Amino acid sequence: MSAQGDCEFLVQRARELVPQDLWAAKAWLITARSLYPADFNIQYEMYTIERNAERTATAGRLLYDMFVNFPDQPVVWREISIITSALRKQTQFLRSLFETLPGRVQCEMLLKVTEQCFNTLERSEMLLLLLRRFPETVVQHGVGLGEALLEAETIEEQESPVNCFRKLFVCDVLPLIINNHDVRLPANLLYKYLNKAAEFYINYVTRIVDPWERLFKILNVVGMRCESYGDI
Amino acid sequence: MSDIRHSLLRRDALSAAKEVLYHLDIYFSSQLQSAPLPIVDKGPVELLEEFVNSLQELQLLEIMCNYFQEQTKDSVRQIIFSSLFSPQGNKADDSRMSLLGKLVSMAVAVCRIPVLECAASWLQRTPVVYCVRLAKALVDDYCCLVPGSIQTLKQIFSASPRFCCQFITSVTALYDLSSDDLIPPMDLLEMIVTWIFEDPRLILITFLNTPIAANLPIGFLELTPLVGLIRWCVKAPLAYKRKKGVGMDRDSHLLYSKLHLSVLQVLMTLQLHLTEKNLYGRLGLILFDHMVPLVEEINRLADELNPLNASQEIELSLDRLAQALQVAMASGALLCTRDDLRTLCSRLPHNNLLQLVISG
Amino acid sequence: AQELSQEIKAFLTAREHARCGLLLLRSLPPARAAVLDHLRGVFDESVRAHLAALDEPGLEDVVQEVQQVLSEFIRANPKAWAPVISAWSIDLMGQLSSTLNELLQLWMGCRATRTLMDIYVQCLSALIGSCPDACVDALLDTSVQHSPHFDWVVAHIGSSFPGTIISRVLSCGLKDFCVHKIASVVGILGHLASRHGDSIRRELLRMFHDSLPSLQATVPFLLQLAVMSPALLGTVSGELVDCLKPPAVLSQLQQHLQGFPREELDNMLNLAVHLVSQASGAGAYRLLQ
Numbered sequence: 016m017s018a019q020g021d022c023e024f025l026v027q028r029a030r031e032l033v034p035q036d037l038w039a040a041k042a043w044l045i046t047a048r049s050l051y052p053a054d055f056n057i058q059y060e061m062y063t064i065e066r067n068a069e070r071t072a073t074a075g076r077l078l079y080d081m082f083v084n085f086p087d088q089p090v091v092w093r094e095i096s097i098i099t100s101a102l103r104k105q106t107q108f109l110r111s112l113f114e115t116l117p118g119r120v121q122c123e124m125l126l127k128v129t130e131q132c133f134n135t136l137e138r139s140e141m142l143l144l145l146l147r148r149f150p151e152t153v154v155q156h157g158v159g160l161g162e163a164l165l166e167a168e169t170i171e172e173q174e175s176p177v178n179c180f181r182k183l184f185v186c187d188v189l190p191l192i193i194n195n196h197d198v199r200l201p202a203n204l205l206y207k208y209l210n211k212a213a214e215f216y217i218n219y220v221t222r223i224v225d226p227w228e229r230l231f232k233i234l235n236v237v238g239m240r241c242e243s244y245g246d247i
Numbered sequence: 248m249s250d251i252r253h254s255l256l257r258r259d260a261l262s263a264a265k266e267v268l269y270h271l272d273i274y275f276s277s278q279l280q281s282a283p284l285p286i287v288d289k290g291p292v293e294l295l296e297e298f299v300n301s302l303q304e305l306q307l308l309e310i311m312c313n314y315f316q317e318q319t320k321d322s323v324r325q326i327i328f329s330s331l332f333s334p335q336g337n338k339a340d341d342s343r344m345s346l347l348g349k350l351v352s353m354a355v356a357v358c359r360i361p362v363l364e365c366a367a368s369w370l371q372r373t374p375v376v377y378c379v380r381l382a383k384a385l386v387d388d389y390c391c392l393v394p395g396s397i398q399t400l401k402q403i404f405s406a407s408p409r410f411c412c413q414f415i416t417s418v419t420a421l422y423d424l425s426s427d428d429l430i431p432p433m434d435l436l437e438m439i440v441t442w443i444f445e446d447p448r449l450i451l452i453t454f455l456n457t458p459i460a461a462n463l464p465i466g467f468l469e470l471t472p473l474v475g476l477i478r479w480c481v482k483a484p485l486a487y488k489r490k491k492g493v494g495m496d497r498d499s500h501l502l503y504s505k506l507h508l509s510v511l512q513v514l515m516t517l518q519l520h521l522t523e524k525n526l527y528g529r530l531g532l533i534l535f536d537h538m539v540p541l542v543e544e545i546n547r548l549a550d551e552l553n554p555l556n557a558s559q560e561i562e563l564s565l566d567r568l569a570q571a572l573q574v575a576m577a578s579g580a581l582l583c584t585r586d587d588l589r590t591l592c593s594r595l596p597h598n599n600l601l602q603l604v605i606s607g
Numbered sequence: 608a609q610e611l612s613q614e615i616k617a618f619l620t621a622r623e624h625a626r627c628g629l630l631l632l633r634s635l636p637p638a639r640a641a642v643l644d645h646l647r648g649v650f651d652e653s654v655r656a657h658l659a660a661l662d663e664p665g666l667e668d669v670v671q672e673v674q675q676v677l678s679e680f681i682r683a684n685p686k687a688w689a690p691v692i693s694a695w696s697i698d699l700m701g702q703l704s705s706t707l708n709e710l711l712q713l714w715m716g717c718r719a720t721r722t723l724m725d726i727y728v729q730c731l732s733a734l735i736g737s738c739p740d741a742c743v744d745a746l747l748d749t750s751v752q753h754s755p756h757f758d759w760v761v762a763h764i765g766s767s768f769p770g771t772i773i774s775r776v777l778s779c780g781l782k783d784f785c786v787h788k789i790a791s792v793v794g795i796l797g798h799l800a801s802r803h804g805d806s807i808r809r810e811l812l813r814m815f816h817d818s819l820p821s822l823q824a825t826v827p828f829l830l831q832l833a834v835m836s837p838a839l840l841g842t843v844s845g846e847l848v849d850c851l852k853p854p855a856v857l858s859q860l861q862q863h864l865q866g867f868p869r870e871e872l873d874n875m876l877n878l879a880v881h882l883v884s885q886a887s888g889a890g891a892y893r894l895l896q
Contacts, residue, residue: 021603038504045511046570046600049577050607301640306619308637349637356635357608388636392687396636 018051026056033064040064055085069108075115082116082124092131095124103144122149135167136179143187153195161188165211176214177222185215186229193236205237248290255298261306263298268314270294271330275323287330295331296339308350315354315361328365334377344377348384355389355403356396363407370413370468371453378417378468386418390432397434404442404449412453415439416468419475424482425544427490431479433499440502443476443509450476450513451520459530473510473517473580474537477571480507481541481564485548488560507567511574518578531582533575539591542568546595554596565598573604611635618645625649625669629676643695646673647702653719654703667718674722678729685733693730693742696723700760701753707798710759724760728767739771747775754791762798769803773810781814784828785821793836804842811843812850819859826863827871830878833886840886848894 029043044061047054062077081091101109113121125145132138142160146153164180171178189208192198212233216226231244251270255263271291278285299307318324332347334340347366354362370378389400404411418439422431431439443449450471463470483503487496514533521527545568549561572588575581583591588605595601611634618627618641625646632642650673653666680688700723704714714720730742750761765772773796780792800807811829818825833840851857864875887894 025603036504038501038508042504042508042511042567042570045508045515046573046604049515049574050604052577301638301644302619305615305638305641309615309619352637353635356637357612387687391684392636393633394683 022047022051022054022056026060029057029060037064037068053084055081055088058085059088059090066112071108071111071115075112078112079116079120082120086127095128099125099128099141099144103140118149122152135163136183139164139167139180139183139188143183143191146188146191150191150195153191154197157188157192157195158198158200160184161192164188165207175218176211177218181211181215185212185233189233190229193233193240200240202241205240209234209237252294252297255294260298261303261310264307265310267294267298268311268327271327272314272318272323275326276320279320279322285326287326291330292335299331304349308346308353312350312354312357312359312362315365316359318361321364324361325365325368328362329369329372332366332369333372334374340377341380344380344384348381348388351381352385352388355385355400358402358406360407360410363403363410367407367410367413367453370417373417373467375417375420375466375468379421382414382417382421385414386422386432386435390434394434397438401438401441404438404445408446408449409452409456411442412450412472413468415442415450415472416470416475419472419479420468423475423478424486427486430486430490433495433502436479436499436502436506439476440506440509443513444505447509447513447516450510451517454517454532455520455524459524459526461530463534469534469537471532473513473533473575474541476506476510477533477538477575478541478544479503480510481568481571482544482548483507484560484563484567485545485552485557488552488557489548507571511570514571514574514578514580516578517580521579527579528582531575531580533581535581535583535587538572538575538581542591542595549596561596562598565595566600569598569601569604621649621652622665622669625673629672632676632680639691643691647695647699649673650699650719650723651703651706654717657717657719661713661716670719670722674726677726681726681729681733685730686737689730689733690741690745693727693734694745696727696730697742697745697749697760699723700727701749701757704756704760705753707755707759707762707794710756711763711798714759715763724763728764731764731768735768735771739768743771743775746772747779750776750791750795751779751788754788755794758791758795762795765795765799766802769799769806773799773803773807777810777814780832781821781825781828784831785824789831789835793832793839796832797836797838800838800842807839808842808846811839812846815850819856819863823863823866826860827875830875830882833882834878837885840882841888844886844888844890848890 025043025047029040029047032040032043041061041064044057044064047057048061051057058077058081062074062081065074065077068074078094081088082095085091098109098113102113116124122145125141125148129138129142129145132141139160142156146157146160161184164184168176168178168180171180173181189212192200193208209230212230216230219226251266255266258266271294274291275285299311315324315328318327332343332350334343347369351362351366353359354366370381373381385400389397403414418431418435422429422435424430448455450473454471457470459470469475480503483506484500487499517532518527521530521532526532545564549564552561554561569592572581572583572591576583585605585607592601592605611631614627614630615635615638618624618631628642628645631638649666649669653670656664656666677688677692681692700720703717703720703723704710715724727742727746731739734742746761746764750757761772761776765776776792776795780789783789783792796807814825815829833843851860864872867875883894
């Protein structure tokens with residue numbers, strides 16, 4: 016008799032007792048884990064039961080366990096995608112579950128989401144969220160996010176410089192990359208920073224909190240790094 | 248020595264006891280300063296027996312708990328606690344058990360974590376019969392004499408969590424569910440289940456906090472109540488089917504299930520913990536010699552109860568026991584094999600989970 | 608803990624003292640004996656005040672508060688509280704009485720003794736259906752200890768509870784006669800014969816039927832009781848003739864007597880002639896014939 020049939024029988028017996036006894040189902044899953052710890056189905060069932068019970072700690076431990084042990088299962092990626100979409104009661108519970116996951120494990124799962132995304136704007140927004148969550152990741156993702164946005168805008172052939180990529184860069188990516196001291200940049204790129212922020216506010220005001228203030232702050236940061244509106 | 252005793256005879260009982268106790272404190276402190284392992288000579292024991300109504304008993308208990316609490320050295324408090332209360336094999340052991348019951352009862356009442364940890368070490372250092380008797384007296388005091396007093400016992404769960412572990416151990420030794428009387432009261436179980444559910448390491452405190460001898464003393468309290476708690480949850484349905492109220496039965500099954508799952512979480516963390524102290528596969532905290540009484544008790548209970556009338560309870564007990572053995576092994580809490588599980592359960596009635604665990 | 612410890616310290620160092628004792632009784636397991644001992648002093652002081660007033664006031668409320676605390680303990684766990692509380696109560700009433708109908712009237716007149724008897728009788732009523740022996744045997748021992756000053760308590764309880772108190776008192780009297788109090792039994796039964804003569808009659812008949820050293824001396828014990836208690840003798844003479852009528856019973860008596868020496872045979876004959884001379888009030892002619 017193959018072990019797959021025994022594992023399926025154990026999982027079915029655990030499932031049948033979920034509406035009747037939660038402790039018994041968790042105990043059966045623990046037994047199956049003790050017998051065959053290398054099973055994705057049993058541990059995933061335990062994770063699903065813990066998540067449905069809204070137990071943040073146990074569900075986070077199990078999610079970390081299968082994310083380390085079982086990365087090829089599409090269900091794990093679906094769960095991580097749902098968690099990231101919530102990150103961008105159920106939403107708060109998913110955020111708590113993500114927080115229970117270790118910080119390095121959080122960064123690695125967000126990076127694995129980064130490698131699995133196709134659309135440019137969604138990937139840019141999620142990378143920016145990664146930057147905000149882990150400012151230490153702004154060093155080797157912040158700048159690249161900004162250029163990737165700029166070349167995406169250029170490829171799309173935006174007749175008006177007003178578009179989502181440039182706005183995301185100037186308002187979110189640009190402050191993150193200029194405000195990070197660890198990010199070493201040449202003096203030539205501040206010219207493009209000022210050019211894009213300037214196109215931003217001139218094509219915004221002409222036609223949000225303060226485009227003029229953000230542009231002025233970027234210009235001041237550029238000026239200080241190179242080393243009222245009237246006295247100057 | 249005798250000069251103090253003559254000076255003690257001219258004093259009243261309370262002052263004589265306090266002079267004895269201060270003299271013992273001074274003597275033990277000096278001996279500990281001189282030697283690392285002191286010797287409890289016949290003199291201190293004789294003085295404690297000679298000099299140490301209910302009113303004066305209450306005063307003596309107060310001022311002695313004052314002495315434990317005011318003692319700044321753990322060694323001195325533990326040693327004097329043992330010397331006073333370690334059963335000496337004399338007629339004063341029954342008094343020892345009674346007076347120790349009163350002492351630790353009121354110490355739990357006022358959360359005397361010094362006396363609590365002292366009683367933990369004493370239970371660690373006491374034969375099973377006196378821990379049984381003391382568990383009897385305390386369980387009475389906190390669960391059946393005055394109802395609702397166990398909440399005062401319950402706060403100890405985390406006050407003196409080491410004392411909590413030794414309490415569950417000696418309490419399991421008494422309330423091993425071998426009899427309806429040795430079924431723990433419902434308040435006691437709700438305490439312990441809440442205790443352990445709140446802290447799986449609560450019963451892992453002593454294992455992680457004591458240099459473990461390769462051999463666990465027998466006839467004493469076992470290192471963990473994991474054996475006792477497993478004995479509890481496992482014989483727990485058969486004892487209540489024997490007792491037969493539907494709601495109380497359902498609540499007992501639920502609290503037993505929670506105790507069992509807490510014990511199992513303890514076990515699956517015990518793989519990591521035994522590995523941490525390099526005792527995984529070396530030291531089986533669940534002694535297989537301490538699961539055999541459990542398994543035999545279960546088989547007898549199934550045999551007498553006319554299995555045609557109690558099939559459900561038999562199946563549940565078999566499933567719980569098989570899971571306990573499997574988790575204890577896979578986590579190294581128990582040291583055994585699968586052929587051992589086969590020969591262990593040859594005489595038992597057929598059960599699917601037990602057959603699967605045995606086959607592997 | 609802090610409040611409870613201060614409470615215990617105040618208790619160790621009358622109204623406030625007894626209230627603190629009752630709080631500690633309600634809060635701490637090991638200290639119940641000290642609380643009961645302290646309340647013994649309150650009851651004794653109240654009884655002394657009552658006796659001084661009889662010879663010629665803020666403690667009676669303490670008495671009732673102790674009563675209701677111990678009574679709530681009794682309903683809370685009769686199995687765990689009634690025996691301790693009942694034994695303490697009997698000890699306390701016996702101590703108060705040491706330091707029959709006239710004794711009854713005088714002693715229920717004291718509110719402390721009435722309170723103690725009420726508590727102990729409720730201990731019985733909680734334990735009559737399951738196990739009254741713990742209270743009943745303690746009452747018997749206190750009757751032994753404080754006789755005859757405790758005879759009124761036993762007679763009053765037998766008036767309340769005849770079916771078991773009568774049998775227990777009869778067994779105790781038989782034991783006393785065999786080992787050698789018999790006046791105490793005579794008086795208690797005489798007060799009880801005023802209201803429960805039928806129950807005493809049935810218990811004595813069952814005792815004698817079971818009789819046909821304790822069993823051998825049962826007949827001399829009953830003869831001694833009849834000699835010292837003419838009231839029970841009269842209540843028995845109503846059906847003594849009906850009881851002794853079967854020839855089998857007469858034979859059981861003759862060999863039961865025959866197991867006695869003639870120093871006891873002649874003694875039994877003389878006891879019989881005395882009883883027949885001073886026992887029969889209306890059925891003399893039938894027994895004579």
